[PDB]
Enzyme design. Structure first.
Site, mmCIF file in Angstrom:
data_model
loop_
_atom_site.group_PDB
_atom_site.id
_atom_site.type_symbol
_atom_site.label_atom_id
_atom_site.label_comp_id
_atom_site.label_asym_id
_atom_site.label_seq_id
_atom_site.Cartn_x
_atom_site.Cartn_y
_atom_site.Cartn_z
ATOM 1 N N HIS A 1 1.012 -1.025 0.077
ATOM 2 C CA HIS A 1 0.018 0.091 0.006
ATOM 3 C C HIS A 1 0.748 1.130 -0.048
ATOM 4 C CE1 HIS A 1 -3.032 -2.846 1.960
ATOM 5 N NE2 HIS A 1 -3.587 -2.612 0.769
ATOM 6 N N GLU B 1 1.753 4.127 2.656
ATOM 7 C CA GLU B 1 2.291 3.615 4.031
ATOM 8 C C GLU B 1 3.820 3.833 3.969
ATOM 9 O OE1 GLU B 1 -1.433 0.644 3.915
ATOM 10 O OE2 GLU B 1 0.366 0.019 4.571
ATOM 11 N N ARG C 1 -3.320 4.333 -2.109
ATOM 12 C CA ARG C 1 -2.899 3.360 -1.821
ATOM 13 C C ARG C 1 -2.730 1.979 -2.684
ATOM 14 N NH1 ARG C 1 -7.211 -0.372 0.963
ATOM 15 N NH2 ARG C 1 -5.635 -0.417 2.611
ATOM 16 N N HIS D 1 3.002 -3.344 6.603
ATOM 17 C CA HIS D 1 2.171 -2.447 6.345
ATOM 18 C C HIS D 1 2.432 -1.132 7.432
ATOM 19 C CE1 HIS D 1 -0.544 -4.244 3.563
ATOM 20 N NE2 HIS D 1 0.054 -5.376 3.816
ATOM 21 N N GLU E 1 1.531 -4.247 11.241
ATOM 22 C CA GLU E 1 1.212 -2.977 10.802
ATOM 23 C C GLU E 1 1.980 -2.111 11.979
ATOM 24 O OE1 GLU E 1 -2.309 -3.315 8.049
ATOM 25 O OE2 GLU E 1 -1.222 -1.802 8.843
#
Ligand SMILES: [Zn+2]
Length: 307
Positions: A69, A72, A127, A196, A270
């Site tokens: 994405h 990010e 993204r 991520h 994440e």
């Protein structure tokens, strides 16, 4: 700029800088690092993987992707830091050195190069990929909903204009299918980590199903260990769990796919933060992010070499 020792890891970079960096590292450590082109993006950009290896046949390998994405930015940043760190830590840290003496690491720093260029050029918060076509004015696919892992199930959108568009079919996106082919051809991946941001989670499968993986005790315990490790530097607090229990149903994800291919150590990260800055994390938090996140990756890699 002229060497990896001169490269500023404490700032965000463009596509060209990160690609040039890949060349600097390969020239500096020709015996350890190889640059592989596994594909071309929708808009024809090279898709690059760095291979760290100390030799061997088709050694068991670790996969690591970042920046699927595009917005990010902390992930592509971490990804450059990691590449340097592999070269620094080999023969210094007994533990990382036992890892590379037996296993290869494949690192994809910009999984989604078209999306990345577009975050620099036109829309910071883009993204998706940049694939066009059909009965839509909307561009791009969510590449982490494009995998053949409960593809097109709830947890993904069939609308092209959606931020979570899954694409036309599983592996429609060349940035995904390139990885798929690459990993299926190699046949000896033991871990598969996708990176991520944000919200400070460590996640294992599944997203697409409420079914429990058979390896859930072990994956859970691994995730616990890696979160403990990560928090030891700066106090940064992660939660961990299966995707579906921790967030929400999500289909066509990376980790569901790799785990269904028999790659047991399939985790998604994440990274920071939890919403103060979100995708627009301050450049001042690059290196601390990269440093702690390393301790968490390292932990998983150790577990891998060991089982
Ligand atoms: Zn993401």
């Amino acid at each position: 700029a002229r060497s990896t020792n001169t490269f500023n890891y404490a700032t965000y970079h463009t596509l060209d800088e990160i690609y040039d960096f890949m060349d600097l590292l390969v020239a500096q450590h020709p015996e350890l690092v190889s640059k592989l082109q596994i594909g071309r993006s929708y808009e024809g950009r090279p898709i690059y993987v760095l291979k760290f290896s100390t030799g061997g046949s088709n050694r068991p390998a670790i996969w690591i992707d970042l920046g699927i994405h595009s917005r990010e930015w902390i992930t592509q940043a971490t990804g450059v830091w990691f590449a340097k760190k592999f070269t620094e830590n080999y023969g210094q840290n007994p533990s990382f050195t036992a890892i590379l003496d037996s296993m290869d690491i494949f690192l994809e720093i910009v999984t989604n190069p078209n999306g990345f260029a577009f975050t620099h050029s036109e829309n910071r918060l883009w993204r998706k990929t940049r694939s066009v076509t059909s009965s839509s004015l909307c561009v791009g696919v969510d590449a982490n909903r494009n995998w053949d892992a409960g593809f097109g199930k709830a947890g993904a959108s069939s609308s092209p204009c959606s931020e979570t568009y899954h694409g036309k079919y599983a592996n429609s996106e060349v940035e995904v299918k390139s990885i798929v082919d690459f990993v299926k051809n190699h046949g000896n991946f033991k871990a598969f980590l996708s990176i991520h941001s944000y919200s400070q989670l460590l996640l294992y499968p599944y997203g697409y199903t409420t079914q429990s993986i058979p390896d859930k005790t072990e994956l859970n315990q691994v995730a616990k260990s890696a979160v403990a490790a990560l928090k030891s530097l700066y106090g940064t607090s992660y939660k961990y769990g299966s995707i579906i229990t921790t967030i929400y149903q999500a289909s066509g994800g990376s980790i569901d796919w790799s785990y269904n291919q028999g790659i047991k150590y399939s985790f998604t990260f994440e990274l920071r933060d939890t919403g103060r800055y979100g995708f627009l994390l301050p450049a001042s938090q690059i290196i601390p992010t990269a440093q702690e996140t390393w301790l968490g990756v390292l932990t998983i890699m150790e577990h891998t070499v060991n089982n």
